[PDB]
Scaffold this active site. Sequence first.
Site, PDB file in Angstrom:
ATOM      1  N   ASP B 759       0.826  -1.204   0.000  1.00 26.16           N
ATOM      2  CA  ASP B 759       0.000   0.000   0.000  1.00 26.16           C
ATOM      3  C   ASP B 759       0.863   1.258   0.000  1.00 26.16           C
ATOM      4  O   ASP B 759       0.696   2.150   0.824  1.00 26.16           O
ATOM      5  CB  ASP B 759      -0.962  -0.003   1.190  1.00 26.16           C
ATOM      6  CG  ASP B 759      -1.744  -1.296   1.299  1.00 26.16           C
ATOM      7  OD1 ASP B 759      -2.250  -1.775   0.263  1.00 26.16           O
ATOM      8  OD2 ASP B 759      -1.852  -1.836   2.419  1.00 26.16           O
ATOM      9  N   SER B 760       1.795   1.316  -0.938  1.00 24.37           N
ATOM     10  CA  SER B 760       2.685   2.451  -1.097  1.00 24.37           C
ATOM     11  C   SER B 760       2.790   2.743  -2.584  1.00 24.37           C
ATOM     12  O   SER B 760       2.429   1.914  -3.420  1.00 24.37           O
ATOM     13  CB  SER B 760       4.053   2.166  -0.476  1.00 24.37           C
ATOM     14  OG  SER B 760       4.934   3.245  -0.668  1.00 24.37           O
TER      15      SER B 760
END
Lengths: 137, 1130, 116, 64, 117, 51, 151
Positions: B759-760
Amino acid sequence: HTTLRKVTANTAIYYDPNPQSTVVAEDQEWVNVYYEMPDFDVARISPWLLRVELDRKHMTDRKLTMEQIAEKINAGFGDDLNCIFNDDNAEKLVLRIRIMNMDDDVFLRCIESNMLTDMTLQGIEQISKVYMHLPQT
Amino acid sequence: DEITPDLWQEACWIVISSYFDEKGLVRQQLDSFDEFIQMSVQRIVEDAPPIDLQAPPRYLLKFEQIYLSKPTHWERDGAPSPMMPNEARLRNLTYSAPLYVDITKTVIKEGEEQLQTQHQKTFIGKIPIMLRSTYCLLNGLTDRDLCELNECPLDPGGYFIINGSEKVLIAQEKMATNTVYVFAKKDSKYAYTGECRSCLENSSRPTSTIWVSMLARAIGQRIVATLPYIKQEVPIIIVFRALGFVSDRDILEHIIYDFEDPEMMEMVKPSLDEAFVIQEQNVALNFIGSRGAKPGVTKEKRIKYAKEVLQKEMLPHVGVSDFCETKKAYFLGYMVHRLLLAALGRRELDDRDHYGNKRLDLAGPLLAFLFRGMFKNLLKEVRIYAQKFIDRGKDFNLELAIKTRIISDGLKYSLATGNWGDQKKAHQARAGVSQVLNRLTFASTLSHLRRLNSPIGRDGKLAKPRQLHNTLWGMVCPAETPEGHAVGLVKNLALMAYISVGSQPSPILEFLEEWSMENLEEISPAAIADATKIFVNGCWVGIHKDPEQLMNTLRKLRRQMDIIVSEVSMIRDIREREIRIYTDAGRICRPLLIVEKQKLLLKKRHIDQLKEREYNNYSWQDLVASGVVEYIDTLEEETVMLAMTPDDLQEKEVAYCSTYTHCEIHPSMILGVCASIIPFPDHNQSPRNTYQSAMGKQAMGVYITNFHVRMDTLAHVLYYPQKPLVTTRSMEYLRFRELPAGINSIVAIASYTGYNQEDSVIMNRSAVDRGFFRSVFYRSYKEQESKKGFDQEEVFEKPTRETCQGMRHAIYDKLDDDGLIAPGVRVSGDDVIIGKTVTLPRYTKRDCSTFLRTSETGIVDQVMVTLNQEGYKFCKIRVRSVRIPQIGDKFASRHGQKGTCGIQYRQEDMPFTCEGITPDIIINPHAIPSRMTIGHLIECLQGKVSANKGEIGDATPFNDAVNVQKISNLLSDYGYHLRGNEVLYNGFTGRKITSQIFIGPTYYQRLKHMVDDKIHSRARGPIQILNRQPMEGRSRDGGLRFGEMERDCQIAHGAAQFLRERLFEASDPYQVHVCNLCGIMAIANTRTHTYECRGCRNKTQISLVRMPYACKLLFQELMSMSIAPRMMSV
Amino acid sequence: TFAGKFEPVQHWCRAPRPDGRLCERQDRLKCPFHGKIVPRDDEGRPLDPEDRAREQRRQLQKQERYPSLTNLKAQADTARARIGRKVFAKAAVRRVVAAMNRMDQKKHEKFSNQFN
Amino acid sequence: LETQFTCPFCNHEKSCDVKMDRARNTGVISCTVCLEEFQTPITYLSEPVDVYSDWIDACEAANQ
Amino acid sequence: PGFVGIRFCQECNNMLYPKEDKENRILLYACRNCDYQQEADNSCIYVNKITHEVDELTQIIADVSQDPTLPRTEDHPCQKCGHKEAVFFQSHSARAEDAMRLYYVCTAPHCGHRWTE
Amino acid sequence: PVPPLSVRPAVVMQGSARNQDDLTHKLADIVKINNQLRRNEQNGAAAHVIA
Amino acid sequence: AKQDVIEVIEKAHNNELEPTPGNTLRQTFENQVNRILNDARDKTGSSAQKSLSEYNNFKSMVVSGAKGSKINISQVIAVVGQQNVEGKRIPFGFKHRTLPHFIKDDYGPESRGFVENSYLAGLTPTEFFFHAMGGREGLIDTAVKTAETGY
RNA sequence: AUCGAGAGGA
Ligand SMILES: [Zn+2]
Ligand SMILES: [Zn+2]
Ligand SMILES: [Zn+2]
Ligand SMILES: [Zn+2]
Ligand SMILES: [Zn+2]
């Protein structure tokens, strides 16, 4: 656990002064069968009749005969509460418990309630449902 | 004539456009406030009783008429001037208008010496005004005129300005009134309990609740009624006897409509037996009178008490006048009847979560609750003030009697704090009403203005009120809800949802007596059997013989805009013979297209007139007047057969319904403001849509057009907002195109260097250099110099090292003579922007200057100086800080795909296509599969098509004219792989990547959560006064909490010295001196080296003990409770 | 639904009544009048000699086995008073209400598809 | 509902005790201080407030 | 058997309670409030249907055929009137919760016949 | 037992107004009613007033 | 699957359906429908799985165990499946109806919350609302279990 | 500065 309510179809209270000439027409056979023989005095009997209609199949499901039920009634209440009943052959499984020694029409209701709920015909109390099965695991 | 399917998809949206041209998005707020000002204040003033005071002379002091002028401001001189909302925002004023009341005070002493003195326009208080309401100065102004007052034309209004702070009233759910609801509690002494919160329609009084219960399992069911103001339960038959229905037959006539039913009858019987002792009205009234007024009361008074409770306090909505007991008896018998049906199982227990059963308490009715309380208190004070003068016999001046601060300060306080209630009852009051308006982004403002709230309590862990009930369809957004501790308790209106404002039932009642209806006192109960009951606002008013043509007549009256207004709900329950008509406020409803036999009433003539809406002034409201559209509330939807689309009306090989009554205008109107932003939300997992509906409110944009003049405490403005390339047709009404909150980014979904895992995202450093997702952060600092008294006065002035005492070592050279920094001055952390000095009782003045919030490093955007309400100098300084996106800044798409920036690569380091397009953002493919945000992929593909075609893509949720195949076929026409994949080349080496990467335009959002506002560190900073432990917060330079679970973890680690360091050494090391004999902390004097216990009278056995300060504090607080914690060192 | 049911009763009690007739009652296991039903022939003699001996022994055992003022003990000792003391017992009523509460719980359960 | 009542005769607060003889359907209210006593019929729905009620009513009626 | 209804006195209009006359040994229905008496024609004082063999057809009303939300069918014509269409619905009540049995109602106006397959 | 000042600090406020702690206010209440009750029990006071 | 559920619905309507031991007739009908529809969802999922290539990236992340599961692939490609509230099909929150778009007493798969579409196909408005109901159940569980597990 | 409230984040 099986109470009388679980196997009962419908209860009713009648005013039957005579056991010989019953209020209901279909119960006239076995009643007069019961009464001519003085095992249990006519005079002792009370006017107020309790008639309970058992359904057949619930009796069969617990493999329960009216004999066992009547024995349980006469054990829980002794001889104070007379019960009579027909054979397990009639189309309607019926048994009549008129009292034999707050009015009796009220009293007999308290009796009826207490019988239907907390008289134990079979089993162990506070075991409500049981499921039998084969464990696959 | 008929709209064909090929035209439908714009006929419908044309209709929707007209709705939003007429109503807007904050129509419920404005209508509620308008109704409150036009009606509720006048109703409340007239419903108050005249205050008759006499020693002799007597005075009544009627209040008869109200006048609410425009909002004006009085200066110190007192000249009234029209105050404009922006001036209120800047000067921290309250945007309120004065309320004046006409008072009539007639002198009556004796001998018919009567004379009336009328005081016209007696200033009774100040009412805060909702912006853009009818009584707002911005009302009816053009976009010119608003801009020319420094107002945003896109600002919806719907909020108050209290002390310069924008406050929004949240609609409060409550359980509807005057309706019988039968529930069954599993764990209780009642099998079944029916209740009615009766409330007289005109808000004379608060709702009074009556309960008619069923005693738990002669042993037969016993029915009792819990009347108001009566200490103990009452058997229902005695209540009926107290209403004069003495014979047992008469009582059952009201309770049981059909005597042929044995089973009802036998059930009721125990109550008849239970009330057999009382046989006549006076004993019943006695019996009820005994419980309540006093243990000892005369019989005549007891009877008067029981009467008074019965006709007033019990079931006020039925009636409060005398000779209503037939009405009361019928409604009470109806409650018992309902209880019996529930007890027999003929009728279902009512559902608490059905919104047909719920009402939304909006700004108007909430302000009415406040105004009722406050006007009551004001009248009480008038009585007291007048009373002392009349006791001394002197005349009293009414103006002096009226202290207007009660209405003014009560409304101002409750809207300022949100504690909804009297200021004294600050704990019985319910908070959360009247929140500060969210001005982060335009979507957050709209959603906050359309916010509903279910006051069940966040502590409650029962999921049932938090579940998305079926009845929320079309009324509440299925998606927009906070994902924290309030999930499903805080809700949001669906786009076309409209909360009814309330109406008078008198036209309907009058019409009903025309028509075949019969009153309830006028019938014999024998007629109620096959007749249909008619309720109006809960109130059984009569019966009817042919409910069908009654319903036809009523519907067709309402569709004509006849006596029945549009917001009136009219439900025919058929199986049970009730017709329930509702005119009250708080009913959430929505517009729907009426359907003929199998045919929309909406023909092409209506669409044609709607197309030229700007010429022939044919509006929505004419569409409603034509009988083509109808507002249906939640409770009436139960009787409605809805077509999802006109294609459902179409004769099919097997007909599903064939008897539809209404049709959706468009199913996408089930979504709210923030969920209407999501493209292709029906291709996402629903939690993702909820997370986006939450995160669209943290997305940066231009929150409002007139941001240059607002001195907001915090504000984020994006440099280059873009409208999405892929949009929904609902955003045209949310004005997202006009104030968008994101940028179309070239997204590649790829694994590139590993810096986008979990989730980056990897951002393009070069794009960021070109202004990509750059924002400006505005922060406003307040200050005022108080001359509260000659003892001490503050003043803005450049401090000096020789006169000021509490001067920090920071330099004050940036300040001017006036003590205020100038615009355009670059200010770093800990710098001074306002030089304020307070006179002392480093002499005769102490420094109390305002510093920057530490570690900000902005530039002073502007400085405003004015006078506050009381009128001292007041300064606002806006500082400006450019926020360039960096590692750790949070970004999100419109599909719940959030992530921080993992790294930034330059354009030559990023992967590139054959035509040298590098992604602006690279997100990891592992964020897709578990999340199932296929809407993200479809939006990326549609956006590639839109950018290559010169479109804006249509991502409206339920659109069969748009699927993935047709988009792929479109994309293959522009020389691209039909599925949105491209050959990319490694930026570092230039080699092709073996996998073809999915790349295209996707709308991304920069969220408020920047790492520079979160990073924090501490090493021996300030400590708290009570316990000498590190402070709390970044702002306080506080320390991080090493909590109980960290202690537990370090115990499991076995790290005893680290645990001691964290919980003793690094928090609050301390020493005490303990008497060795009694173990109580002794008195130590280390300068003179004298150590003694006054308890033991010894000065030689004292020990040093190294303990935490919090533990010393605990032991001292335990001695405060007479506990002796004795630290025995042996 | 295993619940196998049948109603065959071919055997009769056939016990000798005082009126000279044999009992015709088709009880499954017990005649209320003559106790356990034992198989008997056309003149009522039990087929098993041991059963006949036991019945004869049981029959022999059965054959073997201020006054003018009103008595308060008469009210205490009678069938109606005994049934009253039993039925209206604190322990007994509680069980009745407990079962009736289950009866109410069933009424509550019998709207399943709804939210409630 | 309080069970101890102020006596109408001696005005002593909470000095009146109420006895419900249900078997005879009679409620007896007696003041401990002035020893005034009153007897009223009661029903199974009756309460000490009702007995004190009947006492106050009897007093007011007798004092006419 | 059938249920027994409450009967009321004709003087005070209060419910008549059962009682027994020993010197005719006959059932009577007497009022505790006044001193009215009646001779019963029933002889049955109480009836409990534990099985609850209720004919739910009696609970249906023909007006339900006017409900636009109920399903309609052309496959079950009416035996009363021969109308061709009819609404159908389930029992949906306590002690009818078992058994999804369909009840049908004729949609012809003024016929309102109800039945079950 | 009155606790010391550190258990109930009197925190100073942006100006000179010294705000006392809840314990200090409560000890004020206890002290006033204790002194007042003391003068009543010392003097002639109604038993119900002393109560 | 739908046409089998219709089969079962007529049997129940015509009293052709007898209970199984340990369950009421309602509960047996619900079992029998839910096990038709779970068979449907599993079979369609299998079809979608076998359709995948070894260039598929969903499959690539599921074999590696990096992220996702086969049920996710089934929902994205084949069918989202039955939406449950409190472990049961969508409840009749209206009068004998899940929504005002259905007839009363409609126990069919559509009506009670079977999403016969995939996430790529897109949900219909009723499927969208029922799916939102199921997802709300998940969110409530996540937000309510924490206090009680932490205690 | 303290207290409370509210909105948010994981
Ligand atoms: Zn010591
Ligand atoms: Zn025999
Ligand atoms: Zn006295
Ligand atoms: Zn009578
Ligand atoms: Zn017909």
